[PDB]
Amino acid sequence: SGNGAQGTKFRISLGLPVGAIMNCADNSGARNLYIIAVKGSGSRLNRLPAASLGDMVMATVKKGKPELRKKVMPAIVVRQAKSWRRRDGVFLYFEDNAGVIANPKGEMKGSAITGPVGKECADLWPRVASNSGVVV
Amino acid sequence: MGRYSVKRYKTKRRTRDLDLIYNDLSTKESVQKLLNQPLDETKPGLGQHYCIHCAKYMETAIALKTHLKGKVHKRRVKELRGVPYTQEVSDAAAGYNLNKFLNRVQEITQSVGPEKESNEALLKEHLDSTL
Amino acid sequence: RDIEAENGGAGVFNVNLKDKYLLEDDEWKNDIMPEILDGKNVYDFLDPEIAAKLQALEEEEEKLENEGFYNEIYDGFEASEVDDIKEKAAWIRN
Amino acid sequence: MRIYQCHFCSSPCYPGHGIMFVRNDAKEFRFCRSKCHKAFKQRRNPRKLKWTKAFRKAAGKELAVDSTLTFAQRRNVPVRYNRELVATTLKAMARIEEIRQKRERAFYKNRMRGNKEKDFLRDKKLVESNPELLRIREVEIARKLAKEQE
Amino acid sequence: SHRKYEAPRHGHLGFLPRKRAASIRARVKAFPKDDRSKPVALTSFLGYKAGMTTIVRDLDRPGSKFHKREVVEAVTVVDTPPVVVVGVVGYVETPRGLRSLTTVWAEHLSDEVKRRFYKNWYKSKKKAFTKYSAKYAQDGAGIERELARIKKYASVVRVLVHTQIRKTPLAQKKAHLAEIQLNGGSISEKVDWAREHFEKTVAVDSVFEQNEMIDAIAVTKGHGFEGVTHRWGTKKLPRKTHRGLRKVACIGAWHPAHVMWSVARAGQRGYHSRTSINHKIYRVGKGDDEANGATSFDRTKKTITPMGGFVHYGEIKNDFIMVKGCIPGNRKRIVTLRKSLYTNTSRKALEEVSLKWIDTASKFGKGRFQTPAEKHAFMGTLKKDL
Amino acid sequence: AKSLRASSHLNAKSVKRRGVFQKAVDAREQRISDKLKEDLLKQKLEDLKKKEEQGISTSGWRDGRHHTYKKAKLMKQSKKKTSFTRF
RNA sequence: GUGAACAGCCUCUAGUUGAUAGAAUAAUGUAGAUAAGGGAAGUCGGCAAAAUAGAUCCGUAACUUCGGGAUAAGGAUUGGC
């Protein structure tokens, strides 16, 4: 489930394969994040690594501060547009795919998160829940 | 299902909602903030010439004027007249939070309504003067 | 944790969360609270003095019944005449 | 566990049914059906679509303000569990439902009064306006009666 | 030369050949091991798959993320009217395996089970077991001798039972007859139990109970002739490839000069015998319960039958078994429910199921109402009602 | 990871299996046996109520048909030389 | 008739109703379509498809043989009464 995550993770429908671009939901100055790798991904021929809500990816900043650009950093997905099933009894989805920039220990670079944050991601990552103002 | 509806109303191509636009138009401070925006290079027209009703940026003042002289803007204005259909409307239609919905409708009729209408009239005359 | 260790240990012991309830009767701790009845949520009907509210509703219903809330011939026409008119009109439409 | 009402048509949303959309302002839109979800995505007006409870309440097809409709509201202030209070609530829910059904029936009957008068006037006008068909009908009836007699 | 990139093979080689099953009723290949100290019990039961629905479970699972939380889970409903005991078979052990020594039938057999022995019931004189029934006269000589033979020589005892298909909504009038092993006391006690239960019925709650893991044995839904892409899960060839793209491009490129048996080929898909294990019984519902579809959390008085009935099956008016998940076979197919062959060591076998709500909305569409009364109360008064 | 056939895991499973799981299985078997006996007794009572309104050597052959068929079959096998155990 | 139009689509006059047929709807094809989330990660190679498109208005760069580029680009609109 990755280093820094709080416990095990149940399966969520994958919406972001490698090569996807998502928004940046923190206040570190990055505008978008380009997914190049998914942490904890398995191995199968011809299959692209994909990430869901609450996953950690390796991303490069495409738009934002030039100091943040041209570097690879860990990110945590906090919103996805692909619908997924909650065990309470509903399928649901967000407007956009959005992630936040973090460290290998799962600590946010920014100080706050704009927009809603998924319940699964907030429960899996304590620092995301600490920096979230809206949790679903 | 069909290609036209799919490629128009895809999730990633969603637009701003009527209740949010109504809340934006209700207060004079929000109207002033949307009229005086910082110069953004990622928006058409450097973030200027923004129609609040349609939530749409224009590249030029003539483009904004032609948009105002159009049926699409009139359709949006006609849509933004009555109650913005929050969740309370559907709840009271089902028979749930009826008193809350009635109080909300009364507050809209008494306080929110005429102030929003006056703000819309002021925005209209300001656009007419500056255009 | 001592109770958990003596019963099942971590991950096996099933704690009863209703044992700490501060209710008027101690026999009400292990009571299953109903949630759904005939398509309605019981939680948004649960309310003190609902008995008094229902009594007021019954008084209103009694007033309506006393007022008569719940309860073939036309000027210049008889019942047989209007029946014949309806039968002939149905024949004409068919 | 909770029954939700559809954002578009106000129908009940049982667990495992429909779909939910979350907006940027944390607003949850629950739809009982793909039909309502797609209508919402196409941005149609539920108060203009005749098959919705919003339209019916706005147009006066069914009663909207009644004393029976005030017993259900979201309780943001919980109350301590009481067995007799729960039993009283369970009985009261059935009694209120029966009274509400009776009142809705009376409302519909009051709305639909006059239909018989209109239909009788229409039938009278049709009969007065069609003499030849009535003559054909009389001839047919007389021939059938003669056939039955002989 | 070696394949450049490793990948697992497509499909399971232990489920070969992918041919149609020899019968519509799947065979039970293994019964639970017999413990001679235990009381006599049936090892299996027969039912008809009616359909699926949805439940809400108040989960108690210590150590889990969903401990003390509600979960929405899919279930399968099997209509299980009581079976009728009509025979007994004894089996002896030989160096060539188990051999059936003798079979003893009951005195009276219903027409429902007599139809199983006929291909043309309406033209037949219905003479089945007519001379056999005469062997019960004048103290049952012959019958007693064969029962004594089973007691003396048999090492395995099975009981021949049949379903009461006339209690189901099925158009088929021909009952299903099967052998069920008796696990329990001595051989003599098994024979005595069978003799006492001749022509008697056995209900499903005298075989299984709630919170038990069982196995489902059935024939899967058929699909006819199918290509390699959907039969084996092989990757499609690129667009407009010559001679088709739903194929395996090279079925052989090496010395043996034959097509290997482990290469994917087109053929029959479905209608195979399957034995799936560890399905937990969520409810053993009785047919005489007016609220067998209700729970302690949902006080609505309703049965398990959904609005409009189960699609392509009908209503449930008998005892039923609700197990979580899915089982092989389609609706209205005969299924065998078998006891577990081993004592399960997972905590799910010790978990106790408490349902909060059972879905009874219509499966013929996007059903929004649980009862017709709820539908009427929501809609109001219609034109035809006034 | 340890396989399903790992000896230490199977030994731990057997140690667990001899206890609470087997106790639960035995209790379930006793309850099921009690319900089966009750079902038989209820059927007997209903049959009695319905009738109220209305009111060993195993040697040798099984039967004559079995004797005739088996003798004919053995004679046929002897004649056709298609016997598994006898020349 | 629509429409800028000998375009496409429908109709009047005139002329045909010819091409082996019947019954089922497995796989694989030939011809034509749709698809959640991602958007070239496929492939030697964006091959193929998709996207654009009529008319009106605003506006249109480098370069240039000064004639062009140009419908450059980029925006707004279109029904009925």
Add this chain to the structure above:
RNA sequence: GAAUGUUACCGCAAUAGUAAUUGAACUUAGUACGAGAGGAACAGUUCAUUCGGAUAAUUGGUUUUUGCGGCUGUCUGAUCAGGCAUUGCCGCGAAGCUACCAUCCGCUGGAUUAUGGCUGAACGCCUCUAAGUCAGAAUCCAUGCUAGAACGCGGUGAUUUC
């Protein structure tokens, strides 16, 4: 799919195939160990990766249900009701099919390898080895699962009035 009396039902099992895999988490525990910095495992529990077999309650995709409604052009005098536009186009759309885009399920006995031993000679020491013998690998053979010899077999029912 013929044939070994006919026909029907319930079964046996030679042989052939065989399947599961890896990671993380709670607890053990900030414990053993350690100046420190750091820091395990067994026993007891919970999820996930890859694979496999199913399944359609729910969500999503699909539409000749041409089921319902709408739009353009033209034609039937108009309304109504309809034709054509090589499925005219647009929206919704049950049923069926289907998706790691959906859900469920996938085990336990013997014999061993390396190695660690016991008794004990060869060789009056000694020695796990020579005779004998204890354990021990995701290994082998079985349990379990799939097919059922169309020339392998068993039990059982009925067996013709011109």
Add this chain to the structure above:
RNA sequence: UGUACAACGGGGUAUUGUAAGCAGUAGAGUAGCGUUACGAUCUGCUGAGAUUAAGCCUUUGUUGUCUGAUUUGU
């Protein structure tokens, strides 16, 4: 020759979205003499109308059908 079967019909269950016809004083205005005429659309009768197994469920109704051919013996 019957909890018999079939073709219709009835009741449920689902899909769509408010039928034809009549009427109004709702309707931007324009023409004639407050009225009349034309008039996209709107409102009511009307969650109406239409469809619902062709692989949905059920049936105290109506009408019919129940029959030919071939072969098999220890």
